[PDB]
Paper text:
The infection of SARS-CoV-2 is triggered by binding of their envelope spike glycoproteins (S-protein) to angiotensin-converting enzyme 2 (ACE2) molecules expressed on host cells. ACE2 is a type-I transmembrane glycoprotein that plays important roles in maintaining blood pressure homeostasis in the renin-angiotensin system. Previous results revealed that the RBD-binding site of ACE2 does not overlap with its catalytic site, it is therefore hypothesized that targeting the RBD-binding site on ACE2 with antibodies can block the entry of all ACE2-dependent coronaviruses, while sparing ACE2’s physiological activities. Here we report a human angiotensin-converting enzyme 2 (ACE2)-targeting monoclonal antibody, 3E8, blocked the S1-subunits and pseudo-typed virus constructs from multiple coronaviruses including SARS-CoV-2, SARS-CoV-2 mutant variants (SARS-CoV-2-D614G, B.1.1.7, B.1.351, B.1.617.1, and P.1), SARS-CoV and HCoV-NL63, without markedly affecting the physiological activities of ACE2 or causing severe toxicity in ACE2 “knock-in” mice.
Residue numbers in the entry:
A (entry chain K): 1 to 214
B (entry chain B): 18 to 669
C (entry chain H): 1 to 223
The structure:
């Protein structure tokens, strides 16, 4: 029914900063939204009672504002442990459609990933399948691109990626992309390459090997 | 849906569960008191009653979290208005305890105040025995004028000061509930808000009452003139044939009902009225057959049987022994399908009729048992006692009596018996409508300040000479409170519910006799053996307060307001007969004649001509000195001319 | 104190029915509605409905009418959510949460921990392991990366350590991926100075706890 949208989608603000997170309404929701802080692998908690009233047990700096159709969650001089997906609930209509989500990252400087390509192990090629892993180590902007190329042909639709949670020490990300082939199809090409694009790289980095060269 | 609505709905669901099992305990404890008067049973219902009265005040403050502007369901909104109303909880702490002391003082002065004989001051009469039986039975002019005046004066003075204080307070309770005054608080029972063309304002009731009263005024003037002609033969040289009637000659203490003037004003006294009190003895009718004849009266129109626990749990017959009970005929709505009737039934004609009257309330309560708890009532304050009086109206007809077993079948009624019946009805029905209209019109103008506090008793007797046509026999200044000497005024009761009950009663009767295909006049009608008339009644009975009362009227009579043309069709054989009896007499009254007027002496004082300057002001203390100078002049004349010693005072 | 208790990370064959139980603690019980929400992993939350413990009244959103039923036992303070006709789509974390009051304040207070409901057949399966060798493609300057690929297993909780838990530097296990086949797969990689390609021990210890699989695999440069 009511479509609850969040004005940002992802923030990566440094600590000690006063920020503002906005959930825009759909129709007329009269001060009946609630803000929820959900950390990783947990259940969400409460942040704002109706529009600005706070739940006891929360620390300071958590304040909401606005009414009618425009609301703003305000955090002042944020904590390093104030990460999570910050939702906004609905009042009026029964089907309380939970807002989108606004992740909170940190760090200021972006460090280009260390890239590394790993050919399939000889044990796997016995089994009859070839996984080709490409690793991107430590990196702020997660908006990285991994282009596989096989004999210089861009490979589409046989890879899978996953990414780690923002690191609690250095606030970086790490990414692993796996290219999966049959033994038969693997043995039909020579150069396997992994080309990584990222903001900390002036031009993309390619790590590559040549099937069958010790 | 909005959370608000859901919340409200739920709150009401958990409310009606915990209200029905708790109201059942407060009502069953009061039932066990009234059938079984023990002082063990007094606080048996008082700790259970205060468990109910405290439960409402907890759940009233919980209902304030749901405002009304966003509720779209009307059934939910109607239960919230009955529960969110603050009442006397909006006053201060010391004012809410001051108001309850005034109300307990006025109700104690009324019930325990007595009046002593002047020549034997050791015999003093209370109102309810002794003083009511003087005004209802005596034919002596001097004994009726004594009671009246005396009681009047005393209770008057008392209720006076207290009444003023009470009026002053009750207005603060109503203005803090966002009403104009206390009169606007009382008219809120008839208010309907936003049901798309069935609306009804609180100020529209004053217009609808004054519009329907001006059509009763031709019928009331012919009844007032016929009673005045028949009263001049019982009190000669006391009633002017063109003036008003004296207030103490009207059958009871206030003149509310004229029903005790039937023995003086009966049109054909040689013909007895239809009475079946002896055939019920000759057929050996106990106090179970007439309730079985009343129950089969309702199954003939399509209403259901009794609830099969009504016969076991009832008080249909007096114990007689030391086991004591109160005998006021009440219907009971204890809850969860428990309906009980409490009356010590004799074998008489009227207890056969009161059995039809009280079972009308039970058939009303058995209809809206499927409603929610706060909507188990009449559609307004007039509907409840109007359904109960069209059951006794049809059951007392000779067409119904001759087919029930009584009133032997070769019995043709006379057209002089029907006039004897219609006048006994009009002395109670029509005779109370100018009294009911004038009393609420006086109270509505006092509460909103249209009558100042120094003109309360001036405007009371100005409105009685003009509207009611009744003159006082002794002039009453602003030390009296003659309206507060009535029970409903000094005990804080709304009195407009007796005007509208009279108009709905004949609107219901005319709408049911057309459904039962009645041919003759309206006053000989029966609704029995007519299922299609009980269908038109049950469609209003099952509503309760779930629909507005303007919509409940259209389910019976096909209209939206109250109408007075069904009342005049009932008394149409009497109205044509009264216009023949008042061919030579004078119809109407003049508001100038007075019973003390031909023995009065007019005094005219011109202060600024005998003195000019150095002229004093004429306040109430100078009127005291004038009354003591006249009382001095009467004392000297009776001593020096007639040799009597008569102690005239300034109060004479 | 006031807590809500959840039950079971249930793996169900698709097409069947499930029974999710939410046990209460602390507060009374029949004095706080119990709601249920669905959260797809990597997606936002949405609403199922609620069951009132008093009066056993239920309400649903339009996407779940005829999909799930809600029941409650007053004598044991447990609330039930039971879905039926389970497709592959109803595979999410299901939260049970209450709001305080009963009609007053309609905002959530305390939550469960979510019962992970997975819809897949083929029973349980053990992992297949390969070593991802360190290579010059992966080498850059001072460091080079090597790892272990552990794939095709159903029973979600699986662990891979490096050298019996020795190396904590650069060791990063990536979130498991769920294939179309219905089985999970993941790969854990660690960087180590390029002077140390084969020099020291780098053996990944794979342990599968629902089964009893324990295998150590050594990773060495491309021959
Ligand atoms: C009227 O009320 C009294 C109590 O006020 C009842 O007396 C009780 O009778 C029962 C037996 O029926 C005894 O077990 C109780 O101990 C009595 N109570 C007292 C205080 O004496 C009496 O029975 C009632 N009468 C009727 C007809 O119900
Ligand atoms: C106003 O609310 C009442 C509930 O208090 C609604 O009554 C329900 O109606 C549905 C369908 O007619 C029934 O299944 C329920 O059993 C009813 N509730 C109860 C408590 O009896 C009513 O319908 C609502 N009014 C409108 C116009 O929707
Ligand atoms: C009835 O009277 C009460 C006062 O006792 C009104 O009160 C509100 O009370 C709450 C406290 O719970 C306050 O927060 C509000 O500010 C009060 N409002 C006002 C206008 O005083 C209550 O509104 C009254 N209800 C009605 C129907 O008149
Ligand atoms: C209602 O109708 C029934 C049936 O038409 C009447 O019952 C009849 O009454 C007459 C005399 O009173 C008897 O001779 C018949 O034997 C009765 N018939 C039956 C089937 O009982 C009844 O009297 C009518 N009641 C009224 C008030 O008119
Ligand atoms: C009752 O009905 C009878 C019969 O119709 C009425 O008696 C007649 O009244 C007219 C009217 O003046 C006279 O001219 C006739 O001479 C009367 N008939 C007899 C036999 O005397 C009688 O007036 C009616 N009574 C009432 C009160 O309506
Ligand atoms: C009412 O009760 C009587 C028995 O006392 C029964 O004969 C009759 O059928 C009942 N009425 C209806 C409408 O069933
Ligand atoms: Zn009554």
């Amino acid at each position: 029914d009511i479509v609850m949208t969040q004005s940002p989608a992802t923030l990566s603000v440094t600590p000690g900063d006063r920020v503002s997170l906005s959930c825009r309404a759909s129709q007329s929701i009269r001060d009946y939204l609630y803000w929820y802080q959900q950390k990783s692998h947990e259940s969400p908690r409460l942040l704002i009672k109706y529009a600005s009233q706070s739940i006891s047990g929360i620390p300071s700096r958590f304040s909401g504002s606005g009414s009618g159709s425009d609301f703003t969650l305000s955090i002042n001089s944020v904590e390093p442990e104030d990460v999570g997906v910050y939702y906004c609930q609905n009042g009026h209509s029964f089907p309380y459609t939970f807002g989108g989500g606004t992740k909170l990252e940190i760090k200021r400087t972006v460090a280009a990933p260390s890239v590394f390509i790993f050919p399939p192990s000889d044990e796997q090629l016995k089994s009859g399948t070839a996984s080709v892993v490409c690793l991107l180590n430590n990196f702020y902007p997660r908006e990285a691109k991994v282009q596989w190329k096989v004999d210089n042909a861009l490979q589409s639709g046989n890879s899978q990626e996953s990414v780690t949670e923002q690191d609690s020490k250095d606030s970086t990300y790490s990414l692993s992309s796996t290219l999966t082939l049959s033994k038969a199809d693997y043995e039909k090409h020579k150069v396997y390459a992994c080309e990584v694009t990222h903001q900390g790289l002036s031009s993309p980095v390619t790590k590559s090997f040549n099937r069958g060269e010790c | 849906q909005s959370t608000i609505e859901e919340q409200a709905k739920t709150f009401l669901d958990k409310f009606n569960h915990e209200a029905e099992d708790l109201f059942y305990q407060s009502s069953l404890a009061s039932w066990n008191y009234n059938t079984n008067i023990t002082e063990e049973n007094v606080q048996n219902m008082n700790n259970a009653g205060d468990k109910w009265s405290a439960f409402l005040k907890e759940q009233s403050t919980l209902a304030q979290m749901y405002p009304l502007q966003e509720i779209q369901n009307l059934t939910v909104k109607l239960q919230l208005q009955a529960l969110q109303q603050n009442g006397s909880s909006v006053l201060s702490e010391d004012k809410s305890k001051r108001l309850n002391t005034i109300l307990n003082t006025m109700s104690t002065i009324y019930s325990t105040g007595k009046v002593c004989n002047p020549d034997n001051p050791q015999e003093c009469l209370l109102l309810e025995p002794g003083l009511n039986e003087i005004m209802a039975n005596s034919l002596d002019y001097n004994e009726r004028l004594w009671a009246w005046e005396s009681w009047r004066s005393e209770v008057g003075k008392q209720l006076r000061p207290l009444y003023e204080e009470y009026v002053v307070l009750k207005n603060e309770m109503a203005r803090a509930n966002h009403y104009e005054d206390y009169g606007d608080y009382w008219r809120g029972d008839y208010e309907v808000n936003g049901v798309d063309g069935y609306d009804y304002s609180r100020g529209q009731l004053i217009e609808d009452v004054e519009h329907t009263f001006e059509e009763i005024k031709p019928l009331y003037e012919h009844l007032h003139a016929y009673v005045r002609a028949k009263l001049m033969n019982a009190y000669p040289s006391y009633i002017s044939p063109i003036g008003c009637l004296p207030a103490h000659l009207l059958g009871d203490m206030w003149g509310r009902f004229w029903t005790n003037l039937y023995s003086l004003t009966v049109p054909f006294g040689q013909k007895p009225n239809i009475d079946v009190t002896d055939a019920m003895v000759d057929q050996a009718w106990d106090a179970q057959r007439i309730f079985k004849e009343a129950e089969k009266f309702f199954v003939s129109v399509g209403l259901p049987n009794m609830t099969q626990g009504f016969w076991e749990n009832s008080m249909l017959t007096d114990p007689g022994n030391v086991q004591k009970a109160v005998c006021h005929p009440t219907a009971w709505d204890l809850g969860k399908g428990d309906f009980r009737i409490l009356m010590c039934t004799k074998v008489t004609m009227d207890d056969f009729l009161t059995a039809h009257h009280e079972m009308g309330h039970i058939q009303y309560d058995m209809a809206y048992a499927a409603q929610p708890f706060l909507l188990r009532n009449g559609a307004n304050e007039g509907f409840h006692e109007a359904v109960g009086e069209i059951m006794s109206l049809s059951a007392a007809t000779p067409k119904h009596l001759k087919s029930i077993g009584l009133l032997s079948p070769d019995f043709q009624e006379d057209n002089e018996t029907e006039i004897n019946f219609l006048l006994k009805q009009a002395l109670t029905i029509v005779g109370t409508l100018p009294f009911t209209y004038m009393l609420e019109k006086w109270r509505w103008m006092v509460f909103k300040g249209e009558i100042p506090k120094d003109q309360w008793m001036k405007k009371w007797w100005e409105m009685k000479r003009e509207i009611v046509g009744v003159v006082e026999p002794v002039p009453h200044d602003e030390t009296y409170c003659d309206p507060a000497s009535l029970f409903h005024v000094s005990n804080d009761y709304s009195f407009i519910r007796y005007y509208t009950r009279t108009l709905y009663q004949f609107q219901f009767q005319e709408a049911l006799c057309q459904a039962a295909k009645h041919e003759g006049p309206l006053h000989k009608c029966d609704i029995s053996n007519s299922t299609e008339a009980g269908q038109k009644l049950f469609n209003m009975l099952r509503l309760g307060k779930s629909e507005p009362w303007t919509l409940a009227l259209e389910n019976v009579v096909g209209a939206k307001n109250m109408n007075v043309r069904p009342l005049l069709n009932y008394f149409e054989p009497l109205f044509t007969w009264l216009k023949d009896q008042n061919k030579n007499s004078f119809v109407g009254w003049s508001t100038d004649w007075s019973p003390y007027a031909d023995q009065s002496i007019k005094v005219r004082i011109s202060l600024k001509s005998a003195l000019g300057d150095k002229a004093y002001e004429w306040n109430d203390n100078e009127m005291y000195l004038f009354r003591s100078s006249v009382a001095y002049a009467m004392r000297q004349y009776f001593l020096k001319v007639k040799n009597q010693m008569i102690l005239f005072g300034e109060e004479d | 104190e006031v807590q809500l208790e959840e039950s079971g990370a249930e793996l169900v064959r698709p097409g069947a029915s499930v029974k999710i139980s939410c046990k209460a603690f602390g507060y009374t019980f029949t004095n706080h509605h119990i709601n249920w929400m669905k959260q797809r992993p990597g997606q936002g939350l949405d609403w199922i409905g609620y069951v009132n413990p008093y009066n056993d009244y239920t309400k649903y959103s339009q996407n779940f009418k005829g999909k799930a039923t809600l029941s409650v036992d007053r004598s044991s303070s447990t609330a039930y959510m039971e879905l039926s006709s389970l497709t592959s789509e109803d595979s999410a974390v299901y939260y049970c949460a209450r709001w305080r009051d009963y009609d007053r304040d309609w905002y959530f207070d305390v939550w469960g921990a979510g019962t992970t409901v997975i819809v897949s057949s083929a029973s349980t399966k053990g992992p297949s392991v390969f070593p991802l060798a360190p290579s010059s493609k992966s080498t850059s300057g001072g460091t080079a990366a090597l790892g272990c690929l552990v794939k095709d297993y159903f029973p979600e909780p699986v662990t891979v350590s490096w050298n019996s838990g020795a190396l904590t530097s650069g060791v990063h296990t990536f979130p498991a991926v769920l294939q179309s086949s219905g089985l999970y797969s993941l790969s854990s990689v660690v960087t180590v100075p390029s002077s140390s390609l084969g020099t020291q021990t780098y053996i990944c210890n794979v342990n599968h706890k629902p089964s009893n699989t324990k295998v150590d695999k050594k990773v060495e440069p491309k021959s």
